[PDB]
Amino acid sequence: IVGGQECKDGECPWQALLINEENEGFCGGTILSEFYILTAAHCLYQAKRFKVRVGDRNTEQEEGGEAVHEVEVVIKHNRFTKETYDFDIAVLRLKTPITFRMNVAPACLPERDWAESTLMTQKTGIVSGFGRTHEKGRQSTRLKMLEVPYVDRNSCKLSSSFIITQNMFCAGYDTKQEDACQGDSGGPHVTRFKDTYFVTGIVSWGEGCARKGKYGIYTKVTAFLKWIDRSMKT
Amino acid sequence: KLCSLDNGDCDQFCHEEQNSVVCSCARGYTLADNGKACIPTGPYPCGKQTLE
Numbered sequence A: 001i002v003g004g005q006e007c008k009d010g011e012c013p014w015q016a017l018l019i020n021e022e023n024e025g026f027c028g029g030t031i032l033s034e035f036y037i038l039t040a041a042h043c044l045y046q047a048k049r050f051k052v053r054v055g056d057r058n059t060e061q062e063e064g065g066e067a068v069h070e071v072e073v074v075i076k077h078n079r080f081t082k083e084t085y086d087f088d089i090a091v092l093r094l095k096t097p098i099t100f101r102m103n104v105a106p107a108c109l110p111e112r113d114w115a116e117s118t119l120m121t122q123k124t125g126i127v128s129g130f131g132r133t134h135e136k137g138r139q140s141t142r143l144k145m146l147e148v149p150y151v152d153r154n155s156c157k158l159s160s161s162f163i164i165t166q167n168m169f170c171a172g173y174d175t176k177q178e179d180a181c182q183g184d185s186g187g188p189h190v191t192r193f194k195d196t197y198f199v200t201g202i203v204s205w206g207e208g209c210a211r212k213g214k215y216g217i218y219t220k221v222t223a224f225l226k227w228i229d230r231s232m233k234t
Numbered sequence B: 001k002l003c004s005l006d007n008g009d010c011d012q013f014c015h016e017e018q019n020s021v022v023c024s025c026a027r028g029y030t031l032a033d034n035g036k037a038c039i040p041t042g043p044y045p046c047g048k049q050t051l052e
């Protein structure tokens, strides 16, 4: 995360960290229920086999509330293409159920029609992760959050040098130095309605980090809500 | 009109079906007696910033 503020006690409880064999974090994730984790398909190329960390806010020291869960089924989207990052969605099934507490809680899966009419029409969204603080910098040891505003489709396409599909959406600033970076990928993008947070996007890609005239590209959850529900049965 | 004006007084989802607003809640919530508010069925519901 470039700029923004850090996640406090109970602020970002839907955050999940994907760790390798050396406990090093490579990608973010979203908690949906006791057994399911939402992430990006490109994240399943960094390290394999991998594990899931929940209730983590600081990497350099263990905190009272951290838990390690192992993946049982890896439901990666078959239509994923590394050349454009289209269909960048993955659902993970865990062996043991998640216990919900102060730093561990899921995020609601909204209804397709209501999310397009009410959630997408909102002014801002919230992104979190253990990603880079600067474009060329190192990954943050502390969990950070950022308030990113929704960008219209026409302005999104005209700014990008790479193709923007129907499964993608723009969010962030035009000139201000506030955007998501490398390491935040696969992480959550939540939209607030009253006092409840709903899953709206997945941290995917972008032309650098916080670059002027460029925005952050996210995987549109609305186009995959029927696919997520089918994945939660098997 | 209806779901367009103040989300039809619903706490969560709003959907129209041959006049009159219909409110619905996500997994881990139960619809209140008024048929608008969402009441949690557990101590840790989804989308809520925890304190305890």
Ligand SMILES: CCc1c(N2CCOCC2=O)cccc1S(=O)(=O)N[C@@H](Cc1cc(-c2ccc(Cl)s2)on1)C(=O)N1CCC(OC)CC1
Pocket (backbone or CB within 6 Å): A042, A046, A082, A083, A084, A085, A162, A179, A180, A181, A182, A183, A184, A185, A203, A204, A205, A206, A207, A208, A209, A215, A216, A217, A218
């Ligand atoms: C144009 C984006 C891009 C690509 N992509 C991705 C999708 O479209 C084609 C393409 O060229 C590939 C390599 C490098 C770059 S980049 O210009 O250097 N931007 C990089 C830098 C970056 C950007 C982000 C963001 C993700 C979500 C945001 Cl919001 S910002 O995370 N890392 C990038 O997008 N990468 C893809 C994923 C990652 O691998 C784990 C690291 C690199």
Ligand SMILES: [Ca+2]
Pocket (backbone or CB within 6 Å): A056, A057, A058, A059, A060, A061, A062, A063, A066
């Ligand atoms: Ca830790």
